[PDB]
Amino acid sequence: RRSRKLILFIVFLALLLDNMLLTVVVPIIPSYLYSNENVQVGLLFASKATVQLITNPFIGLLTNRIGYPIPIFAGFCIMFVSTIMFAFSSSYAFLLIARSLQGIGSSCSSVAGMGMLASVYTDDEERGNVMGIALGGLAMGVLVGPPFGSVLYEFVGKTAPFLVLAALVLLDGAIQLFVLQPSRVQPESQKGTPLTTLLKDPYILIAAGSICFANMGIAMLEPALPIWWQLGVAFLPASISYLIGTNIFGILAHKMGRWLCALLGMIIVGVSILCIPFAKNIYGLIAPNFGVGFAIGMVDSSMMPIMGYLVDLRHVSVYGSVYAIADVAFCMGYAIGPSAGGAIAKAIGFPWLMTIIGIIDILFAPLCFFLRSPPAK
Ligand SMILES: COc1cc2c(cc1OC)[C@@H]1CC(=O)[C@@H](CC(C)C)CN1CC2
């Protein structure tokens, strides 16, 4: 009733449905907008990520205090509510409210799920493979969001995508209730490491910063696009590379040494974003997006297991707070990317900002090298 494969499949389907509900509202954004960079789409991107950043550490403490399954089930009882709220959203305020709920549900699911994955798969290699599979599920969600949403919303109606996603969610929630059975509390054995200590560390800082700055590029590029069939096939070149990269490096990273794969993933992000401006909409902006996605997938699949590795090598073997920190770093892009990046743009323009990002990415790339051999304690 607790085989590792089942929990891995849980986290897979969790991140898949979460990101599908995330990106399925894209064909529904203009239908609430019209009724450079955008401000309203910026707020739609912001609110959820900001609430996720607000709620990640508190979830990382809740899991250590009552267990993982109850957080995961709270996530899957929230997402089912946010989906219905979406399905019954007319104005802008209700849209933002539903997005923030969805954000709390996401934060919950992602943090507690990565924590359970690191807690079950105790060994390394297998944990690398497992994190790769989970991020591949996330990628599959990002891929299957836009086209599914577009086709349904354009075929039968605008409520149907949200309601079908609600049904899929409910099925996922039932599966999870069968596999995990959170009907009883279960606190972890050891007292978790104080978050202040985990944050004072250099190495977790370096890994989290690498994730954050490898995500910031594609986080600032998207909410400022020529859009808002160019809407459904908008985010295909990014996700079709994210998946192919993560579900290949998750299994072939430890053999090379993550430190090398992380450095290469940051370099590739940099060289892709730097070349973004040399493009047009249909012909140009595709291939650089593919490079960006492949590289950020490499970086994510290389840096997600390291977090648990660092904690096992230098702290008490608990996985909640550290993966909450990793998720905070990953999602900080979409909170300070649209608004602050939008202001930087409207001051200087996007053909300049992307270069700046590329510079900071190429500078932060060799800083991963200090993830070669962290001295234990
Ligand atoms: C509708 O809201 C949003 C829309 C989308 C996203 C973010 C938003 O909100 C958080 C994700 C975030 C990711 O994970 C990116 C993965 C890349 C690297 C392949 C891709 N974009 C796609 C669009």
Swiss-Prot record:
State the tissue distribution.
Answer: Expressed in neuronal and neuroendocrine tissues. Detected in central and peripheral nervous system in particular in axonal and dendritic processes in dopaminergic cells of substantia nigra, histaminergic neuronal cell bodies of substantia nigra and tuberomammillary nucleus, in ganglion cells of sympathetic glia and in peripheral sympathetic nerve terminals in stomach and duodenum (at protein level). Highly expressed in chromaffin cells of the adrenal medulla and histamine-storing enterochromaffin-like cells of oxyntic mucosa (at protein level).
Cytoplasmic compartment segments: 61-69, 121-129, 182-201, 254-258, 312-315
Membrane topology per record = Multi-pass membrane protein
Q: What is the effect of changing residue 334 to F?
A: Slightly reduces sensitivity to tetrabenazine and FFN206 uptake. Reduces serotonin uptake. Reduces sensitivity to reserpine. Largely reduces sensitivity to tetrabenazine and slightly reduces FFN206 uptake
Q: Which GO terms describe its cellular component?
A: axon; centrosome; clathrin-sculpted monoamine transport vesicle membrane; dendrite; dopaminergic synapse; intracellular membrane-bounded organelle; membrane; plasma membrane
The portions of this protein that span the membrane are 6-26, 40-60, 70-90, 100-120, 130-152, 159-181, 202-221, 230-253, 259-279, 291-311, 316-336, 342-363
Q: What is the effect of changing residue 142 to F?
A: Abolishes binding to reserpine
Tell me which UniProt keywords the record has, alphabetically: Cell projection, Cytoplasmic vesicle, Disease variant, Disulfide bond, Dystonia, Glycoprotein, Membrane, Neurotransmitter transport, Parkinsonism, Phosphoprotein, Synapse, Transmembrane, Transmembrane helix, Transport
Catalyses: serotonin(in) + 2 H(+)(out) = serotonin(out) + 2 H(+)(in); dopamine(in) + 2 H(+)(out) = dopamine(out) + 2 H(+)(in); histamine(in) + 2 H(+)(out) = histamine(out) + 2 H(+)(in)
Look up what happens after changing residue 223 to A: Abolishes dopamine uptake
Control of this protein's activity is summarized as:
Strongly inhibited by reserpine and tetrabenazine. Also inhibited to a lesser extent by ketanserin and fenfluramine. Reserpine and ketanserin inhibit by blocking the substrate-binding pocket. Tetrabenazine traps SLC18A2/VMAT2 in an occluded conformation and its inhibition is specific to SLC18A2/VMAT2 but not SLC18A1/VMAT1.
- Phenotype when changing residue 114 to A: Reduces dopamine uptake
Outcome after substituting residue 218 to V: Reduces sensitivity to tetrabenazine. Largely reduces sensitivity to tetrabenazine and slightly reduces FFN206 uptake
Resulting phenotype, residue 22 to F: Reduces sensitivity to tetrabenazine. Reduces fluorescent false neurotransmitter FFN206 uptake. Abolishes binding to dihydrotetrabenazine. Abolishes serotonin uptake
Changing residue 99 to A has the effect of: Abolishes binding to dihydrotetrabenazine. Abolishes serotonin uptake
Q: Which Pfam families match?
A: MFS_1
Write out the GO biological process terms: aminergic neurotransmitter loading into synaptic vesicle; chemical synaptic transmission; dopamine transport; histamine secretion by mast cell; histamine uptake; locomotory behavior; monoamine transport; negative regulation of reactive oxygen species biosynthetic process
What's the reported outcome of changing residue 124 to N?
Answer: Reduces dopamine uptake
Q: Which family does it belong to?
A: Belongs to the major facilitator superfamily. Vesicular transporter family.
Q: How does it assemble?
A: Interacts with SLC6A3.
Give the linked disease. Parkinsonism-dystonia 2, infantile-onset: An autosomal recessive disorder characterized by infantile onset of abnormal movements, including parkinsonism, dystonia, and poor fine motor skills, as well as autonomic dysfunction, including abnormal sweating, cold extremities, and poor sleep. Some patients have variable degrees of developmental delay.
Name this polypeptide is given: Synaptic vesicular amine transporter
Protein source organism = Homo sapiens (Human)
